[PDB]
Amino acid sequence: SITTPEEMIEKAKGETAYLPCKFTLSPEDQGPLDIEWLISQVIILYSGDKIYDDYYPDLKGRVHFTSLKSGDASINVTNLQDIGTYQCKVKKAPGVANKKIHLVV
Amino acid sequence: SITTPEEMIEKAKGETAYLPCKFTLSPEDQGPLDIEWLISQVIILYSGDKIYDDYYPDLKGRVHFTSLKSGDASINVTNLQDIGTYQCKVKKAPGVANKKIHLVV
Amino acid sequence: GAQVSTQKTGAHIHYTNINYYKDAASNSATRQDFAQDPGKFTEPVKDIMIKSLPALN
Amino acid sequence: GAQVSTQKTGAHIHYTNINYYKDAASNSATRQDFAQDPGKFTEPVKDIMIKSLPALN
Amino acid sequence: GYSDRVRSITLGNSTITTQECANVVVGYGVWPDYLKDNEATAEDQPTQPDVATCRFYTLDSVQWQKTSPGWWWKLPDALSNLGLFGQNMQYHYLGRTGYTIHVQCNASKFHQGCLLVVCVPEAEMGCATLDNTPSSAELLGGDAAKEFAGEPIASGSNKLVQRVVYNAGMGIGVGNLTIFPHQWINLRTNNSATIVMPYTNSVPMDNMFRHNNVTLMVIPFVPLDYCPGSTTYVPITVTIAPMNAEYNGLRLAGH
Amino acid sequence: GYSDRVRSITLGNSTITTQECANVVVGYGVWPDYLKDNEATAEDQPTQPDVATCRFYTLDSVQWQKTSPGWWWKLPDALSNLGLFGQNMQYHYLGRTGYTIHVQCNASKFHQGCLLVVCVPEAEMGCATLDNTPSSAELLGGDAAKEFAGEPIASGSNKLVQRVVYNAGMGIGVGNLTIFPHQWINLRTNNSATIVMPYTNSVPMDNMFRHNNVTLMVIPFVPLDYCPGSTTYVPITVTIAPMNAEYNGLRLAGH
Amino acid sequence: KVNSMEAYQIPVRSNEGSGTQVFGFPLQPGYSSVFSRTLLGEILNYYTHWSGSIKLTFM
Amino acid sequence: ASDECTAGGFITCWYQTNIVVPADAQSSCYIMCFVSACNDFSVRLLKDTPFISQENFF
Amino acid sequence: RVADTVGTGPTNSEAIPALTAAETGHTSQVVPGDTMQTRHVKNYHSRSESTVENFLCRSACVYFTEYKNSGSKRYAEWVVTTRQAAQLRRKLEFFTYIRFDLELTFVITSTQQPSTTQNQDAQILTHQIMYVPPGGPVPDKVDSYVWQTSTNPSVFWTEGNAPPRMSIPFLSIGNAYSNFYDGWSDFSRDGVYGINTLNSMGTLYARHVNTGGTGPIKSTIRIYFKPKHVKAWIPRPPRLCQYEKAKNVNFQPSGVTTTRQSITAMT
Amino acid sequence: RVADTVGTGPTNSEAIPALTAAETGHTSQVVPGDTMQTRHVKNYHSRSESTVENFLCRSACVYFTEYKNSGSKRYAEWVVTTRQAAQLRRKLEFFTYIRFDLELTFVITSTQQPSTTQNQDAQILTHQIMYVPPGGPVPDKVDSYVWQTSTNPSVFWTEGNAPPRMSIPFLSIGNAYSNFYDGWSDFSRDGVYGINTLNSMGTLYARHVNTGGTGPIKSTIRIYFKPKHVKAWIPRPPRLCQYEKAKNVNFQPSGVTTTRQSITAMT
Secondary structure, three states, X not given: OEOOOEEEEEOOOOXXXXXXXXXXXXXXXXXOOEEEEEEOOXXXXXXXXOEEOOOOOOOXXXXXXXXXXXXXXXXXXXXXXXXXXXXXXXXXXXXXXXXXXXXXX | OEOOOEEEEEOOOOOOEEEOOOEOOOOOOOOOOXXXXXXXXXXXXXXXXXXXXXXXXXXXXXXXXOOOOOOOOOEEEOOOOOOEEEEEEEEOOOOOEEEEEEEEO | OOEEEEOOOOOOOEEEEOOOOOOXXXXXXXXXXXXXXXXXXOOOEOOOXXXXXXXXX | OOEEEEOOOXXXXXXXXXXXXXXXXXXXXXXXXXXXXXXXXXOOOOOOOOOOOOOOO | OOOOOOEEEEEOOEEEEEOOOOXXXXXXXXOOOOOOXXXXXXXXXXXXXXXXXXXXXXXXXXXXXXXXXXXXXXXXXXXXXXXXXXXXXXXXXXXXXXXXXXXXXXXXXXXEEEOEEEEEEOOOOOEOOOOOOOOOOOOOOOOOOOEEEOOOOOOOOOOOEOOEXXXXXXXXXXXXXXXXXXXXXXXXXXXXXXXXXXXXXXXXXXXXXXXXXXXXXXXXXXXXXXXXXXOOOOEEEEEEXXXXXXXXXXXXXXX | OOOOOOEEEXXXXXXXXXXXXXXXXXXXXXXXXXXXXXXXXXXXXXXXXXXXXOOOEEOOOEEXXXXXXXXXXXXXXXXXXXXXXXXXXXXXXXXXXXEEEEEEOOOOOOOEEEOEEEEEEOOOOOEOOOOOOOOOOOOOOOOOOOEEEOOOOOOOOOOOEOOEOOOOOOOOOOHHHHHOOEEEOOOOOOOEEEEEEOOOOOOOOEOOOOOOOEEEEEOXXXXXXXXXXXOOOOEEEEEEEEEEEEEEEEOOOOO | OOOOHHHOOEEEEOOOOOOOEEXXXXXXXXXXXXXXXXXXXXXXXXXXXXXXXXXXXXX | OOOXXXXXXXXXXXXXXXXXXXXXXOOEEEEOEEOOEOOOOEEEOOOOOOOOOOOOOO | OOOOOOOOOOEEEOOOOOOOOHHHOOOOOOOHHXXXXXXXXXXXXXXXXXXXXXXXXXXXXXXXXXXXXXXXXXXEEEEOOHHHOOHHHHHHHOEEEEEEEEEEEEEEEOOXXXXXXXXXXXXXXXXXXXXXXXXXXXXOOOOOHHHHOOOOXXXXXXXXXXXXXXXXXXXXXXXOEEOOOOEEOOOOOOOOEOXXXXXXXXXXXXXXXXXXOOOOEEEEEEEXXXXXXXXXXXXXOOEXXXXXXXXXXXXXXXXXXXXXXXXXXXX | OOOOOOOOOOOOOOOOOOOOOHHHOOOOOOOHHHHOOOOOOOOOOOOOOOOXXXXXXXXXXXXXXXXXXXXXXXXXXXXXXXXXXXXXXXXXXXXXXXXXXXXEEEEEEOOEOOOOOOOOOOOOOEEEEEEEOOOOOOOOOOOOHHHHOOOOOEEEEEOOOOOOEEEEOOOOOOOOEEOOOOOEOOOOOOOOEOHHHHOOOOEEEEEEOOOOXXXXXXXXXXXXXXXXXXXXXXXXXXXXXXXXXXXOOOEOOOOOOOOOOOOOOOO
16 A cells, blocks of 8 residues: 555755655555554554654654645654664554665665 | 433422432333332332332431322432432333432532 | 246346245345336426426526 | 256266346356357457468468 | 416415415425325224315414524424314324425515425434433424524433534434425525425324424525615514314314 | 526537527528538548537636726637647647637626627737737737727837727727627626637638637627626636537647 | 534635636545535445436535 | 545536626625436445444443 | 436537526436537446345344343343444434334354353253243243243244244334334323334343353344335435434434535545 | 367378468467378367366465454454465466456364363354445454444354355456556556555455353464356466565566476476
């Protein structure tokens, strides 16, 4: 469902990194939208139509949704140092898809 | 089955409070009639065609049926002080209905 | 005493039904009843209103 | 309303089929359909090419 | 010549005349008729006044303010106290009757608005508190407007009926009500609306006091709007005429 | 019943509906038709979309101020950049097409005014300076009003087209224009005017970019007048639908 | 406005302009909220496949 | 339900001209919209509706 | 089978099919060709699965109750009523009056309750489902004389067999089940008001014929109702607000419809 | 029945049947007698088992999922799709378009999970298989209102009975299931690309009606698909490389064919 699930985004230190997690929903998918972001552990959560900082010390106040249930769950991490694999797991009861982004610098 | 199951009867101290528990029986209902009154615990009981004081200290000799199996189970509490929710539970084997009355003053 | 009727097939076949129980309230569901008449609810006006002609003359 | 058809036997017999369900999507598999036409995929050329005659004159 | 707008309905000893009107809606396509013997269940000889009861009764007018949410009339209850239709209803046990609802609301060319004149069968309504049902005189009104209220009715230990207009008191979409025989009173073109309602009940006859088969609901979808200088008190008056009244079971009066 | 005013024109995939309209004027009495073979001169097989091009195109609305002298639209140029009619016009060399002009301008009963909706064939216009001719984009307008100006255009070393309304830019009496198929929009009775124009050219087909056969001119003979309190912005919107498009000479796009 | 009779009315007014959009909604009789609780749309929500025309009647 | 493959389309309304009114008359009119299915409407594949909900029996 | 479209060419005439008067209450019968050009398409689609019978013929659970084989709740007593559930209830409400036969199917499931009794080797469970018609004697204990079965229709089902299925003919004193009743049982208009007053379809009793074993076992019985031979009258708008009670239509005021961003938004 | 050979004697003529032109794309229709002498042999062999229907009518498991009766995974949710398996998927791919009815059969198997709870005397297990059509409400917990079953087709099967088998009619908005789709769902051409975009056949939910007993039991449900009444269009070359994903045709480059020793080797 998620566009381009394997991605390698390399960006220099100092500018915001845009991490896309655009997803398309099947007709069979009629479930609460749970969007969770992981780093290698939970950076942000979206359940019950609200956004959760999740008290992540490395990335607190630097991570926010760029856009939502419309189909966009991208994140613009600001003021990078952060190097790791960022996993975005949009969740639906029939199928749950995940996207892994490798971030460099 | 019981008429107006949720009720809020406010009455000044000193006069008898009439607490109605009028009920209508379905054709499917062919069971012994058990009428029990509760306060917030058992004030009166009606089983086997007899009335029970139930030794309730707060309301002994001040509580009596105003009318019976005809369809009336009202109570005229006399000489109020008693503030609470009075629950009347007429009982039938297919369905048992309960009525809650909030009493004030 | 078997009743033979056409099966529901696609567009562009027979099946045999025998009523076992004599009660007649045990018969299988009568699904094959494709009859409709929208006049009762749609177009319920007393006087006919030709669509081509102006409605309120 | 029973349909009687020949059973698949060797070379060198009947069986009876009755459609119970009226839906018609529940019918047994239609295996006995031995029809073929290779012209669609084999020999798809617009102009006929007689094998005995030379192909490219 | 001919004109579709003009129409004159005569019943009993009282007739009505509407210069601008939209085509009459004949219920579900069945003009009301007397109980045929193929489906009768009361063996008593029914009395049929046919003039005394089948006449145009004019109820009480109600004001259509720019803040008026809606109104509902239980048709049997509305006529319970008017004329012989009321007297014979009080006496007889069983009662079967068709209805000829007619709602009048005339406004000048510069007014604007829109009503939904729809008669709903079995309008079972819901009380503000979920556990108890509404009491009579709250659900029912004798020649009374029984107006809807836009604000959700506060839910306490009471028997106030939900007057929420956007639900019509039946917990259903008010827009979806159109399924029932309905005629609109768009002030710009038609000042009157008439629905002929057949007798719609599951049993051949029912006591009118015991149960109200149909309820006329007037719900203004578009609020009345006028510029200063126009008449500010435009009323809505409802004239309901019974048809083919048939009554059985003569008993002593009362209920 | 019947009514002359109401009319509905359907073409392609877009239809128009006018509650009050005057009878359609069918050009010079010849409904547009495809090029008959008795008079064809292009040997190429013509493409005829017949739905893609024959549909109602709605141009840009223009305000009818009490000071507005008039407007003119070169029909071929007006649709040069709208949809396939524009695309196929850009590609093909030769182009033959009939027209179904329709001008809408609705006003309340208290407004007054009068337009002359007339399509003029070969509207050759004159420049302010006698020696030179007007330039393109001054004479022509793409979905543009190209408004007339009441004052005589100052004549200098320029290419401004004479917009003098009392001459219509052709040095002819504006009143005498009536000879061309014309329909009036008198606000008091008809809010719409429709002229079906046949293909009027001396040659069987002509390049639409090279030459504009017909030009719709809207000239308000009686100015709009309204008392304070009425709507002050009443627009004039023109919906021109091509008919029987026939194109030859497929080439690379451009001009 | 979904909590009042204002949900059904579509507002129009005399504005000094033309071509201004009055409203707009996707053709999804089942999923679109505009159509979801309408009698056609709600009955459609009891099915999965739909096909045919729609008579949008503007009064 | 929603699907990129079977997007139904877009329905919209515009002002062809302007809603002109005379004086002493309101300039803010309202328009109501109705929906219906033509005589070529079909449905298939019955499913339970997603609008109703329940926690325990009533 | 659904009606098909008819071809149309360009038109220009006084007759207007689109312009109409919705005040009359007649939904315009306008085909696609009226307001555009359309080709002749033969529609082979059939309105077969939208039939009232096909619409409401699906088996749908109405109520599940649980009775233990040893303890306080030896037997389960449920008054028959389709209002307890939500999906089937909402399906039926679409029609003010409805006349349908019933095909009750019972899905019974047992469960060894946690305990401490050892050597739990229970024999196969046997269950009895008894329908008491209204006005009939009703059991008070799991072993009263009523359970013996005199004339009431009861089914005995040993566990592990195919689920019991008994058909019920239309059971109503009136000429049709009334989904909505705007009336009181009492002429005085004082008392219960609603569907409950006129609809009594009897009571259902489920018990363990044999205790089964040493250890306590809890038996869940699920009751499925499938309307058949259905005839429906007077269609009504579907219930917009969530149900709150089984005996009444009382509701909580809810938004006409889920909101969107703006009046021009496409989501 | 297959065509037979016709006798031929020695020949010497200008006509050449062997020499042809494969550039045209016409596979030469050369019988054995054309390039040699052959006898008249009546071939009674029949191409009966090579029929498309006989080729794809075998029941073939597509997906097996396991749900416990107590713990985190109380119920199993699998989106319907024939791409999960390999053998049946490869069989279907041979044809670009295919139109077949389905006969789903479920093989459910239970297993007493190792634990420490004593006196494990579990009663017979009962299972429910529910098909949620696309756009339908989907269960979140094992006991949500969705499990009650309103209109969705569900089958209740007690363990030890013959495996449940419900037939499915052709379910596709188009005129045939598309095995391959060279297209995007989005007009913009940005998003998911492939068969997954156009094929949605709903979701399948399996749960334990009754917990069964004190001890934990894990239930494995295997889903079998058998195409019936199959019609196939546009034959395509079989998938040479091993499948790597279910939602896409992505593959790992593989040798055209297993190699041999030399160009003259006979192994």
